[PDB]
Amino acid sequence: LLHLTANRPKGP
Amino acid sequence: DFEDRVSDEEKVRIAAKFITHAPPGEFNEVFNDVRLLLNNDNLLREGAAHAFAQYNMDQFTPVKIEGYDDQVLITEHGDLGNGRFLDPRNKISFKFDHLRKEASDPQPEDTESALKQWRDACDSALRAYVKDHYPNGFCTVYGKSIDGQQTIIACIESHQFQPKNFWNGRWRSEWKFTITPPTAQVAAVLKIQVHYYEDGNVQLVSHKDIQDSVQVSSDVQTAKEFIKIIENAENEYQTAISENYQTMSDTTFKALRRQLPVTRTKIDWNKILS
């Protein structure tokens, strides 16, 4: 499965 | 802190827990995930063997036995121990590999001559009921004695797996008729699970408990009355689920967020800053 939230920017 | 570390016993308990919560039709994917996360096949094989069997019995997994036309449900009511299960329609035991979902080594199994007719008559009525009411459903009917009461237990399964479209669903229902002439107590639980996972994870979990009664008489006539009660409750359950969907749609969901602001147009983001 493709994980869209894994290509988000990392937090502070 | 090190004294509070997660033990291997706790890791495989968690592994086993995830496995029993796999959605219908996705056991293999959840198993493969858990196997790679635990990274200890020996520990997995030992500490999660009970969970593989529990998944299949919980899920009423239907299995084809080589040499017999009808599929049989894997349920707790059929667990004969030592990895074997009862097929009460074909009066046989068989070995079941819970990982590969494969039946093997069918052998004749002893059956009390008493409940033969009553179990056969309920099975015959239920089979026609299930073929009429489900697209690809399967059922298994056990006849046992729990305490002093001669009990009929009817299990129905129906699933549709479409993983290339990112969804699976399963219906299960389990009906118990405890015979206490001239009546019988009817207890049942109906279950639905649906999983949609294209760019998301949405799941329906539903169950309904049934309590009814029925006058009992001949084996053939009581089986007809049993199936009439099943049909009525299952039709009613399925209708109410669809009415409830409609209510959720136009009441709760509509109230959570509007489609547009009262202006009937999208926001002017320069006026918002003002």
Binding site: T5, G11 | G137, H159, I241, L256, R257
Partner: protein, 242 residues
Amino acid sequence: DQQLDCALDLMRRLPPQQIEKNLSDLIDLVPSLCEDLLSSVDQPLKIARDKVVGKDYLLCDYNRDGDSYRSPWSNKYDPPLEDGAMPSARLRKLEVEANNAFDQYRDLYFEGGVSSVYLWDLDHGFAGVILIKKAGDGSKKIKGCWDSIHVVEVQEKSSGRTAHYKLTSTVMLWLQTNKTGSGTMNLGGSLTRQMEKDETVSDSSPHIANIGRLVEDMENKIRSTLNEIYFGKTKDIVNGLR
């Protein structure tokens, strides 16, 4: 090493009714993935109270530092932290403006609920999360809740005339009823969508305006896809079982 891939795959399959419990179980299962899982696994939003300003704010991993959380109103951590992560001074000013803008957006679309926005500096721009939570009133014996999580990444150019925006948006929708006809019925989970585009950045089209349009367009879209998936697709699947 596919453990993180397998962990995310697992969270796509285990019942979303137990998201919080399964994430903590999953971190117990593989502690080395904790930081990656906390940043990539969306969880239901929790509400906290900014006692200084008397306002509610929303808790997620992006405004967390250790065991404390940063309020978007006061810019302070609770429990207090001596050197908690904070946005730069200029970014903080944009963050205040964003919180005001999306507070109005919240009132316009949700007529209630709570919002929070948190920004953080990046090497060549910034990122932020826009959070909205709205619980249903309980009418007709239905419990309902909505969580929005919008994560935007903004890549700025030396020329300052154009910037690249990437939006990853998740809406979690939860509904449950217990009625005599349909028994217990829990319909819950989430959908995620992504998009990106270059936008003009000008005095008449500033960052917050560009982000707000992207978020509004995305959320209107996800609202309609939740309607389709929840009350169309999963219902259709139920009726195909019998």
